[PDB]
Amino acid sequence: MEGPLSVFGDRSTGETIRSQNVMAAASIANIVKSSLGPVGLDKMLVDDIGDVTITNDGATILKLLEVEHPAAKVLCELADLQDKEVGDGTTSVVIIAAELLKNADELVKQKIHPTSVISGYRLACKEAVRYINENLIVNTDELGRDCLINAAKTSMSSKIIGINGDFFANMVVDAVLA
Amino acid sequence: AGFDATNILNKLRARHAQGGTWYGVDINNEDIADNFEAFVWEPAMVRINALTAASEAACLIVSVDETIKNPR
């Protein structure tokens, strides 16, 4: 860690255990960034000199990772519990989750009273909640040019290996409607 | 002014989302408000002067990461 090393256990006596957590938060987030999604490169995860695994998943590495930092603790579960939510946000939560605990406690400490800063990271997310729920704008499969057929197609034509989106513009429609 | 910069600075930003005429933090009054109406008064000429310096005074050496010196 950083700071006084003679008192173990997340007493670094001051922001030393805040920063060692946020720099760990940033560090534990460094795992998932280059792992983010498929464009995020598959990591080869050494489980032992004889044990490895290859995953770019955000929640797969961190279940395997050990975290004795509190901010590294909250980051693994957030990758996992949002995976437990969906699996969208195995990677997603991790990046800013390093930042917001680094972003939160700073002003919280500044307190006029700590209650003020808590919403700042909720409020914009709430304002993202509306904005996110305000989105029919992209991802709508039901509204296509071909509707479900292109919802098939464009989703097939995203993963397209081939004539996926030709006969397969039909199938995802056929499959869900069979 | 005895003030925390940032909150005051952020206020001034909000105060420049509200106001923005002369508003600023004035150690003159140790307040945050219109400067020119706070009797914070200096010609606008020195601004361009400083700002001709500000951005340009920095861009000189950052144009040089290879800097040669000689004994002679």
């Binding site: 256990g9 938060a25 280059s34 983010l36 999604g37 498929p38 464009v39 909250v74 969906v86 699996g87 969208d88 946000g89 997603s92 939560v93 990046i95 989750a97 930042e99 917001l100 605990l101 972003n103 939160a104 406690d105 700073e106 919280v108 006029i112 700590p114 700042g120 990271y121 909720r122 914009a124 304002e127 993202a128 996110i132 729920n133 305000e134 989105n135 992209v138 991802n139 709508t140 499969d141 509204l143 919802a151 098939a152 197609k153 464009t154 989703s155 995203s158 993963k159 397209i160 290996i161 995802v172 056929d174 409607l177 069979a178 | 940032t6 952020n10 206020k11 001034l12 909000a14 420049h16």
Partner: protein, 178 residues
């Protein structure tokens, strides 16, 4: 194909279809089927929600400078508070397109090209394209592709984003245990 299936024609309790994927080998069908499932899933994820959000951070990098200016809106410590998160809706694409090696500072150039004072707009429509297609690294006008995620998966992570932040605060009295 030397592959036989027992065709039950006009199933009278309810309709059905069993779609036979033609590969020259069986693993050609999985490339289809992997393209199919996510196509099936994303349409099923549009069967999860009507309101649906674009893949990629053009959703976030929009509100980013929207809400990092909304920092200034409340000003004070909240301009600190609100910006700290709303500066961070910039960073996810900075991971996204860079995972595609697009130098997302070029992407946020394209993102915030969409993201305007004139376009603050999730709407349901695009006067700005809010889609960021993560099979590329730069926005594509697909809204039916399989990469995008429903509004269910996101507002979740919004809690998770703020969850690493204040979860670690509520402690009092840092101590040492022998």
């Amino acid at each position: 194909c030397d592959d036989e299936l027992i065709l039950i024609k006009n199933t009278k309790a309810r309709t059905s279809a069993s779609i036979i994927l033609r590969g020259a080998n069986d693993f050609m069908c999985d490339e289809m089927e992997r393209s199919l499932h996510d196509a099936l899933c994303v349409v099923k994820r549009v069967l999860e929600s009507k309101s649906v959000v674009p893949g990629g951070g053009a959703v976030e990098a929009a509100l980013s400078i929207y809400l990092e200016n909304y920092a200034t809106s409340m000003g004070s410590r909240e301009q600190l508070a609100i910006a700290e998160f709303a500066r961070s809706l910039l960073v996810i694409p900075n991971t996204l397109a860079v995972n595609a090696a697009q130098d997302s500072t070029d992407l946020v150039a394209k993102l915030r090209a969409f993201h305007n004072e004139a376009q603050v707009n999730p709407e349901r429509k695009n006067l700005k394209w809010i889609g960021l297609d993560l099979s590329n690294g730069k926005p594509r006008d697909n809204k039916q592709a399989g990469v995008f995620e429903p509004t269910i998966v996101k507002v979740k992570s919004l809690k998770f984003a703020t969850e690493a932040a204040i979860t670690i605060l509520r402690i009092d009295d840092l101590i040492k245990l022998h």
